[PDB]
UniProtKB/Swiss-Prot annotation:
Source organism phylogeny: Bacteria, Bacillati, Actinomycetota, Actinomycetes, Kitasatosporales
PANTHER family: HYDROLASE, ALPHA/BETA FOLD FAMILY PROTEIN, NON-HEME CHLOROPEROXIDASE
Record-annotated active site: S94 (charge relay system), D223 (charge relay system), H252 (charge relay system)
Keyword match Oxidoreductase: yes
Protein name: Non-heme chloroperoxidase CPO-A1
Regulation: Brominating activity not inhibited by azide, peroxidase activity stimulated by bromide.
Purpose: May be a chlorinating enzyme involved in 7-chlorotetracycline biosynthesis. Able to brominate as well.
Subunit composition and interactions: Homodimer.
Organism this protein belongs to: Kitasatospora aureofaciens (Streptomyces aureofaciens)
Family: Belongs to the AB hydrolase superfamily. Bacterial non-heme haloperoxidase / perhydrolase family.
Molecular function as annotated in GO: peroxidase activity
Amino acid sequence: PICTTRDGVEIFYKDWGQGRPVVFIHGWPLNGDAWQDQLKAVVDAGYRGIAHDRRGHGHSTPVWDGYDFDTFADDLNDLLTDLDLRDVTLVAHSMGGGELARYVGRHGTGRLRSAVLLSAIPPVMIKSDKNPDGVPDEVFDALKNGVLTERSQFWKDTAEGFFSANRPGNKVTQGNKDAFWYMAMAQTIEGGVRCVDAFGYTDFTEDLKKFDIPTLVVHGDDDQVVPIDATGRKSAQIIPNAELKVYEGSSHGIAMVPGDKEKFNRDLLEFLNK
């Protein structure tokens, strides 16, 4: 289905089931198909599962502008308002965690019950003297140059790090890598590069302090994209009352990789009863 935003943008989304709503917010450079395993899991447990495609991704309008967290959060606000959703759990992966954080910062928690941050970017990714465990600027430069040099090959090469597929004995399939590429080919090239600038450099520390709902932070300690020590370990300390679950040996692609995705589904379903 399509939600038309305040600006006339069409946001595509899946809306399955009946019950309290669980809204899933995907990472770069994918789309709501990155959550089909979790959407089935929550609807089979008696929840309504919704997953939208960010502007410029999947089947949403291939826009030029608005690749910034304030716009992503307002687009999320339009979807929650159009469907008049209440008592919602927002579940976000990777840069989707910035959309979730900025939604709380801008619109508050009146429609929300709880939140889940899976392998998410808050509080801030960029390395500096204040954040010595963050990601160096050269990495973000390299991501943007990869998308501009030849994006199709770049997604094939990036899938290796995304799933930590360099680890001997991993459970990542060739299919996982092919599906990563398939989802990424639907993203605009401008969303490809502008999202890097947004997720690398935006600081969500002040938004995190406004959380007043139960929050679960899950993060793998072999995440080669979003470093656990700079992000998940810190957001769990800033968000009031947050719980942290470290997934030993897990990559950045926990929701899609065999074995890890069942562990996450089990944790998510336990948390949803809160």
